[PDB]
Each structure stands twice: as C-alpha cells, then as structure tokens.
Design a binder for this molecule. Structure first.
Ligand SMILES: *[C@@H]1O[C@H](CO)[C@@H](O)[C@H](O)[C@H]1NC(C)=O
Ligand SMILES: [Zn+2]
Length: 1014
C-alpha cells in the first residue's frame, strides 16, 4: 500500500502551489477578453504535419433547471433525440455525443421496436456516442462521492443493458468548478479520458500559457500516479459555439448557423453568420481555420477538439440541416486546399482522445502531471460561484438523508432474494433514480427555479417512502422465525422513526409510541447499523408516558433517560422565541448496541410509576419574566432563573461552558486539562447596493459579516445522565448544543423568514494558530488543504464544505463535521465559519431569472471535535492533503449514517428475534462497506451481490486500536461459488479471486467486488 501521508507527490502542477503564485489580474486580453492575442507560425503545419480537427456536435440538456425534467423532455429533449435519430440515420458522416442518460432512457423506452433498432445501430456504428454515461452530469461541489458513483452506475448499467456500450471518456462542460473526486471514481470505473470546462478564468490563462490544459490528473496524495486520468480542460469562457471555435467570439459566432434570424437567435457581437457558398467559402474558411490554428496553439498535439453545440441544441430538423450542410461545405473546401494543411471532420469525443494518444505514442507530445481541485470557480471579474455551496439548504440536507436511506434499503434487502410480487427491485430503482437525478448541477446546487426545486423535493419524498417500504419489509423478514414469517408485501410492519429529518420544528412527522394499561403495555423497536462494525449510539423515541423502561430481547434491563418534548415558538404576542413542553408526549433515550451491518431488537414497557432503570432529566429555563411550564406526568418540575453562564458535563466526556446567551464559550477535554476558548457566534452578510448582486450562484457580500443582534434570548438547559443540552432561540435560528459523553452535536433549526438579502453564517472563534491555512473536504471523500488568499475577495475564499472542515496548529485542532453540504471558510487565524442559509431578492444574471426567496425551515446538524494533535503523525508542511482523526471520522459517520430506528406497527410481533448479524465480522474502523447491492433478480440461477469497499485514512496519534476481524465481503452470504474484483459500477470483471476471498483495500482506496452464489 502507498503511504498517503509521508510522501509528498512530485507533480508538474499542484493547484494550491499555483494559487499561491498566481496574481489573478483581470485585464482585457483583447478579443479573447480573459487571455491574450494568440499568435502562431503558419509554417507549423504542412503536408507532412497537418492539423487534424474534430468538430463534435453536442446538445447540453439539463435534467431540470428553468423547467422540470418532464417539461424539458416534452418541450425539447424528446424532439432533439427523435431528430438526432433521423438525421444521423440519414447522414452517415454526421456525429453527435450524448451525456444525460436520465433523458435518453426516458426517450428510448417510449420508442417503437423499429426505432429502438435504428437507435442501437447508429450507436453501434459510432455516429451517436455516449460521453460519461451517468444518469446526469453531476454537481462536483456539494455531491457526496457515494451519490456521484450511484448516478454513474445508474446511467452506465442502463447503457450496458440496452445500448451494449460503456463510455470510457467523460464530458463535464457545466458543473460550476471541478473536483478530483471525479477522476478518482472514473479511473476506478474503466475510464481513460475526461473533459472539464468551468474553471477560473485566471487558471485557464495560466495553464494555456504553459500548454498545460491537457494533463494527467492524479489525487493529491498519490505519489506513484496510479490514480492518474488524462484530462482535457477547455480554454475559453463558455462551451457555446462562440467560445469553442477559437479565441474570438465575434468570429466564432458567425459559425453557429442557428443564429441567422428564423430561430430567434442572433450574435451579440453584431456580425451574423452567413450561409456558406462556393462564392464565399474561401474567405469563410480562411477566417475559421485561423481561429482553429489559434486554439491549437494552446495545446500540444496536432489534433484539435472543436465542440459544436449549446443548451438544448439540435432540436429542429432545420437546425440539423443548417449546421451540417454549412460545415460540410467548409470541410470539403478546407480539406481540398493543401495550403491550409488541415483535415477537418465531424467526430466524437472518443475519436478526439484516441487521436491525441496516437500522437502521444508517436512521441510528438508529453503531458504534465497535476493534482488539486478547481474551486472556487469565477467566470468573470469578481463573480465567484460560492453561493451555490449553500443555496436551498433544505434540499442539500435532504440529499444526505436520502443518500443514507438508499444505502440502508439496498443493504437490508440484499440479504435475501425477493419474489417479484414484493416489488423490491421496483422500489429500489425508483429511489436510486430520484436521488441520482438530484445530483444534477442544478439540483443539489440549489440553482433551479422554485417549481423545479419542488419537483426534485417531491421525487425525493417518493424515494424516501420507497426506501422505508423496502427497509421495513426487510427487517420483518430478517427478524421473524422462518416458519412463522407470512408477509403482506403492501403492509407496514414497521414505521421508521427519524429524529433529525425533517426534524423538530420542521415537521411533526414522527409517531408517538402509545402505551397504556388499557390499550398496550409494550412495544418492540429495532435498530439497524449499516456500518461494518459493532456500534453503540443513543437513540430516542416519543412515548405517551414518562414511566417507560427498556429491555433487550433477553429481557436485560437497559439504562434509559426520559426528557420532555420541547418545541420552540415565535410568540407573536410577547414578541419572544421560547420553548413549550408537551404534556402528553415524552422522549425516552437509551444506548442501542447493534451488530456490524445488523439489527438489534429492544422493548419499551410502561409502568404505573418511575421504573428502576429510567432516570429523568432536569430542565432549567433561563430568561427574565418567566412563566410556568407544566409537563403533565413528567416527574421533575421545570426550574427558572435569570440568564447566566453555565457549564455542563455528560459522563466522562468534555466539560462545556456557555455564555448567558446560550452559546458555547469553551471546551475542557479532561478534568485536568484547561478550558480551551471555542466561541460560537452568528453573523450576517448582506448584498451590494451597487454593481453585481448575489443570487443563487454568486456570493457577492457587501463586506465582512456583521454580528446578529441577539438581544436577551431564552435559553433552555436540559441535564440528564445520558444526554444534556443547551438550546437558545436566536433570531432566525434555534441553536442547540447536545452532549452525550463525547464530542458535542450541534443542531440549528434555521428559519431565515422574510429577512431579504441576508446570508446567515455560523462562526467559531478560537486561539488556534492556524494562520491562513484550513482544510475542507471534497465530496466526503478526502480533505484538501486550503490557503486563505487576501489577494482574492472574500467570496473567493469560500469553499464547499460537503461533510467537514478543520483548522489546526502544532498542538490543537478543531474539526466541524456536517450532515449537509454548505459553504464555508476560515477568514482569520483560529476561525471556522459555515453558511446556514441565504435569502436573496435579486437574480444574479446567469439565466435563472429569479432570486432565492423560497426558503423554508431546515434542521442542520453537526459534530464539533476539539482535539490535541501534537502527538499525531501528520503530513509534512508541503503535503496538499489533510486527514481526520478516529474521533472526527466516527463523528462524521454518526451524522451521515446513523442507526436506523423501526417501530413495530401491530400490537404483537409473533416469532420476533432479538438480533441479526451477530456473526458479521467487525471490520477495522477506517473500512466501510459503502454499498451492498444484490445485482440479480430471484429468477437467476446464480445470484450475484456487489459490494463497494472504501478505506479512508485516519491519523495515527498513539492509540493502540486493536481487536478487529478481517472483512471478506465475498463470504457474507453463504454458498459462494466465485469472487471477482470489478469496476466500481460492477460492469466489468477485473480479477478472479482465488479462495473466493475479497481482500481489504489500502488507505484512500475504493474497490468493488461481486460474489456469486449457487
Ligand atoms: C456487444 O458488443 C460486443 C463488442 O465487443 C459484441 O461482441 C457483442 O456481440 C455485443 N452484444 C450485443 C448484441 O449487444
Ligand atoms: Zn447545465
């Protein structure tokens, strides 16, 4: 295994280093506004060395943006694909590339058999070529790597089954900035090439000047280079025709033949395209070839890529004709005029890459190596696209919830083969597809119109329900005596109880377990642990009585804590935000211990009085002018007092101190250690009254954030043996700090209400001497080193925080893990900040046509880990990566993949079993079974189950960390006949494993295995 910590990779271009050296000056470079006047030697190409030009027709189809997926399909896409089929069929030399499989599948299944065959033929013959082949072209900033893989697999599995093809070239022309997580996954999925477009204009200029636009992109920790994937970065401002033929859009626009008038399009540079004729072809060709040769100067081979397309292009038959005919005339002339020394033709993306590598093998070009990412993107001036790291945070959080539900549903149902009547495969396909669709760069990004966001939400809600159905049916089968099991595949044996989604104060969705002497004495509950190691976690349920005790199935008492059910309300009368307690519902909390990838059953029983093994939390309401707070049957009376500083400690965990405003002030790790200053503060960013305004994409603050006026907020302190908390009702945010014995959990119920042109940020202030360095993760896969650059505006220093961020000095580190992707930064030494929500009244001129005024309450969750790191073996000062500690990694897992809770619906569960998976191996803490999916339906003689195994890299800080079993996923199911290593999509077999044993992977590696069972 490669050492991902101590060996700094030697690469030609390291993005953090490049950023440190670049000046980012935004000067007018001429016709190529952000470049320079390209010059070339006409004698460079000749009869013995011609410029090969591939014009690649394409159509960018957004699976939702200003219209819903279905609206675009009906109005545009079905026509684009229908006419593509006809035109390609009738013109053998014409070519076309397609990226969005969600749309292609929607189209293909509606086609008659005759047309399906014609479609398969033009794909088989190479006229229509799929690029990437994912369900969508995903966002690369907010997306979790697990979902990027999910959507890629969804699209490619469909392509293999119906088109009999698997793309090895990727096309990503629209994500707002690019992540190395893409080549990571792609390279492990059979890919050999990839193309990107939206990178900072300064970066394009810098790399263009050194002809480093094509490079071998390797991971930041990869010293050997085995993760490298050839990457092509487009050099200009856009992927549209005016910015893809050469450096001068005024000239290139004249070669977009759809802009002559009848199509309602024109050229903003004032010179319209002109139909090619024998009379003007010589002059037209001279202009075009000149542009091509200028573009060619920016690359190293004699093979040039010229994309020909735009948003939803090639829709009308007349459009296909106008583009094809005019280009055909240009090709005939150019290719017949030796003085040009050019051979141009329509081509596909793969054809371009094949030619490039042929030139490379011929030894005419050597490519540079590169590591790093391409955030934060700016398309012009100071317009940095960091706003979408936070836009529509409700759905960003929903993404992570559904991500987990999909994993749990696929895993729980994978243990058995199901009869078709159970509709398991049907529900799982629906769930995977709705989640996959949301990975779109206008989905999770929060950059779609309001009604489109609603469509995505509805789709995900249906996916969540599908997931619940599959999960509960699976639990019933896994924990019921075989000879008693009698399933009704439409019946709900269990109801899922989720305490953090939609969340308290967001939607009263979770059910109350109703117990009573005259109705029902007890209730069975079951917890699922999707992680491959034994796990303990506190779980809570709402019960109709405070006198409830918990037992495991062996009837062993389990220590429990009962607390009130508190809800915060914006009192319109008193003009205050205060909590009200329920007098009929209560929260029971207890520690559940669940097997690796298993289930554990517990029983809740009511009694007439306080049970021996259940304790009750004390409650203290701090504020002036308090009023009574009755809690019905709740044992202890609420206490009151004027606001004051408080200190709390649960178990042997840390001791936290809070200000009289209910905000964290310090953390004391041990009784001996000191009180380390760690202050939570909420501030607000505004919008500029002059110039460019912030919108769904852009973050254009009117200066540093201003503190939110808190006044004298109401603070609620709940102290219990198992769980304690401090909650405060601040303007726009009910902030909560929860303690359960380890790193605290932070929950923010964010309701920005009607505060227009405001962005609410949560900041942490410490004494950590971090300087200008901080770390943020990329797609929940890796942590990359960031350097605050004062030479860039505030918004440029904001980065995606898909799952976590941290700052550190020689001795201390503070890590904030998130349960949702949001934007964040470290604007000063010792600080960490992350945006909660943003409400913007104006549009930011990127085509959305609206601001962001559809905010809704969202419950954001986090874990805050303060640690001493002076003893940890960390990367050298020059290493571009960072790594989490065991505690921080586990805290992240507690947020993204918590235990699942099921409540038995009926009064009695006959044949109930107390546990499943007690014999499953408990794998090393850094290893995870990211995916477990049965790949075959019940009718298959040989069943196949696929697994995606990921091993992260945790810092070694002197902790023994022992007793763990080797995890062989191929033997998790009985009767294994063969074990194979496959691409991450499970589509290609890479190795036949001897002994049918799937070996564990190396740190930072991800592998896929498929076990076959007779
Ligand atoms: C799929 O493509 C492969 C190309 O290697 C070919 O051998 C095979 O016959 C094709 N199968 C079909 C008909 O889908
Ligand atoms: Zn797009």
């Amino acid at each position: 295994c490669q050492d991902v910590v101590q060996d700094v990779p030697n690469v030609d271009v390291q993005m953090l280093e490049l950023y440190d050296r670049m000046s980012f000056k935004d000067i007018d470079g001429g016709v190529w506004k952000q470049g320079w006047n390209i010059k070339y030697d006409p004698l460079k190409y000749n009869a013995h060395h011609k410029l090969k030009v591939f014009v690649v027709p394409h159509s960018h189809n957004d699976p939702g943006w200003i219209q819903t997926f279905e609206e675009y399909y009906q109005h545009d896409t079905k026509h684009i694909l229908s006419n593509a089929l006809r035109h390609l069929h009738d013109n053998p030399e014409m070519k076309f590339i397609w990226a969005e499989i969600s749309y292609f599948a929607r189209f293909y299944h509606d086609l008659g058999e005759n047309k399906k065959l014609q479609m398969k033929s033009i794909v088989k013959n190479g006229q229509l070529e799929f690029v990437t082949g994912g369900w969508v072209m995903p966002d690369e900033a907010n997306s979790h790597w697990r979902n990027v893989l999910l959507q890629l697999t969804e699209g490619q599995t469909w392509l293999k089954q119906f088109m009999n093809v698997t793309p090895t070239a990727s096309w990503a022309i629209d994500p707002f900035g690019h992540s190395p997580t893409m080549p990571y996954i792609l390279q492990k999925s059979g890919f050999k090439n990839m193309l990107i477009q939206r990178t900072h204009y300064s970066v394009k200029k810098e790399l263009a000047q050194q002809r480093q636009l094509e490079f071998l992109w390797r991971q930041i920790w990869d010293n050997k280079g085995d993760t490298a994937l050839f990457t092509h970065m487009m050099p200009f401002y856009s992927y549209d025709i005016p910015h893809t033929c050469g450096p001068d859009p005024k000239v290139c626009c004249q070669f977009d033949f759809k802009r002559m008038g009848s199509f309602g399009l024109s050229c903003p540079w004032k010179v319209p395209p002109r139909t090619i004729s024998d009379q003007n072809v010589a002059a037209r060709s001279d202009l075009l070839v000149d542009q091509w040769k200028k573009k060619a100067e920016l690359y190293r081979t004699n093979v040039l890529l010229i994309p020909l397309g735009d948003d939803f292009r090639f829709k009308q038959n007349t459009e296909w004709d106008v583009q094809r005919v005019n280009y055909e005339r240009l090709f005939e002339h150019i290719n017949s005029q030796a003085h040009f020394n050019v051979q141009a033709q329509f081509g596909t993306l793969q054809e371009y890459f094949d030619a490039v590598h042929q030139a490379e093998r011929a030894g005419q070009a050597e490519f540079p190596t590169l590591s790093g990412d391409f955030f934060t993107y700016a398309d012009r001036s100071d317009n940095y696209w960091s706003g979408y790291y936070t836009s529509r945070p409700y759905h960003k959080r929903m993404d992570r919830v559904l991500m987990h539900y999909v994993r749990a549903a696929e895993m729980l149902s994978a243990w058995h083969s199901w009869d078709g009547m159970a509709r398991i495969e049907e529900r799982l396909e629906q769930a995977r597809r709705e989640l996959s669709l949301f990975q779109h760069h206008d989905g999770i990004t929060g950059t779609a119109k309001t009604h489109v966001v609603v469509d995505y939400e509805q789709r995900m809600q249906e996916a969540l329900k599908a997931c619940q159905m599959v999960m509960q049916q699976s639990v019933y089968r896994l924990l019921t005596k075989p000879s008693i099991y009698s399933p009704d595949f439409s019946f709900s044996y269990f109801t899922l109880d989720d305490s953090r989604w939609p969340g308290s104060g967001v939607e009263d969705s979770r059910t109350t377990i109703i117990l009573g002497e005259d109705i029902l004495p007890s209730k069975h509950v079951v917890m699922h642990n999707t992680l491959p190691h034994w796990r303990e976690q506190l779980v809570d349920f709402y019960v109709s009585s405070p006198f409830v005790s918990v037992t495991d199935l062996a009837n062993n008492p389990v220590e429990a804590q009962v607390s009130p059910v508190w809800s915060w309300h914006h009192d319109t009368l008193t003009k205050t935000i205060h909590p009200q307690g329920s007098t009929t519902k209560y929260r029971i909390i207890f520690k559940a211990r669940v097997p690796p990838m298993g289930l554990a059953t517990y029983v809740l029983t009511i009694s007439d009085s306080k049970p021996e093994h259940t304790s009750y939390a004390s409650n203290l309401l701090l504020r002036k002018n308090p009023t009574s707070l009755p809690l019905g049957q709740y044992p202890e009376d609420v206490k009151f007092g004027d606001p004051r500083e408080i200190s709390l400690r649960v178990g042997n965990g840390p001791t936290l101190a809070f200000s009289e405003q209910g905000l964290l002030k310090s953390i004391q790790l041990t009784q001996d250690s000191p009180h380390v200053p760690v202050h939570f503060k909420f501030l607000k960013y505004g919008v500029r009254s002059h110039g460019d305004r912030s919108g769904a994409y852009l973050f254009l603050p009117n200066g540093p954030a201003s503190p939110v006026e808190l006044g004298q907020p109401v603070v609620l302190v709940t102290k219990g043996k198992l769980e304690s908390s401090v909650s405060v009702g601040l303007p726009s945010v009910v902030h909560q700090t929860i303690m359960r014995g380890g790193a605290p959990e932070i929950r923010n119920l964010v309701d920005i209400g009607s505060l227009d042109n405001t962005e609410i940020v949560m900041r942490l202030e410490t004494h950590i001497d971090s300087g200008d360095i901080f770390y943020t993760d990329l797609n929940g896969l890796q942590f990359i080193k960031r350097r605050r650059l004062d030479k860039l505006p505030l918004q440029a220093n904001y980065y995606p925080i898909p799952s976590g961020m941290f700052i550190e000095d020689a001795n201390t580190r503070l890590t904030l893990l998130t349960g949702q992707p949001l934007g964040g930064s470290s604007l000063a030494s010792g600080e960490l900040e992350i945006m909660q929500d943003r409400r913007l009244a104006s549009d930011d001129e990127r085509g959305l046509g609206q601001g962001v005024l559809d905010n809704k309450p969202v419950l954001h969750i986090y874990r805050l880990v303060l640690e001493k790191v002076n003893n940890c073996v960390r990367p050298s000062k020059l290493h571009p990566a960072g790594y989490l500690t065991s505690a921080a990694h586990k805290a992240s897992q507690s947020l993204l993949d918590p235990l699942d809770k099921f409540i038995f619906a009926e009064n009695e569960w006959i044949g109930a079993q107390g546990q499943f998976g007690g014999d499953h191996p408990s794998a090393r803490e850094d290893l995870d079974v990211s995916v477990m999916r049965r790949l075959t339906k019940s009718s298959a003689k040989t069943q196949r189950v696929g697994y995606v195994l990921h091993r992260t890299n945790l810092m070694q800080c002197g902790t023994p960390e022992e007793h763990t079993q080797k995890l062989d996923v191929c033997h998790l199911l009985p009767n294994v006949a063969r074990c194979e290593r496959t691409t991450l999509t499970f589509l290609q077999n890479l190795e036949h494993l001897d002994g049918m044993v799937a070996p564990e992977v190396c740190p930072m590696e991800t592998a896929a295995y498929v076990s076959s069972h007779s």
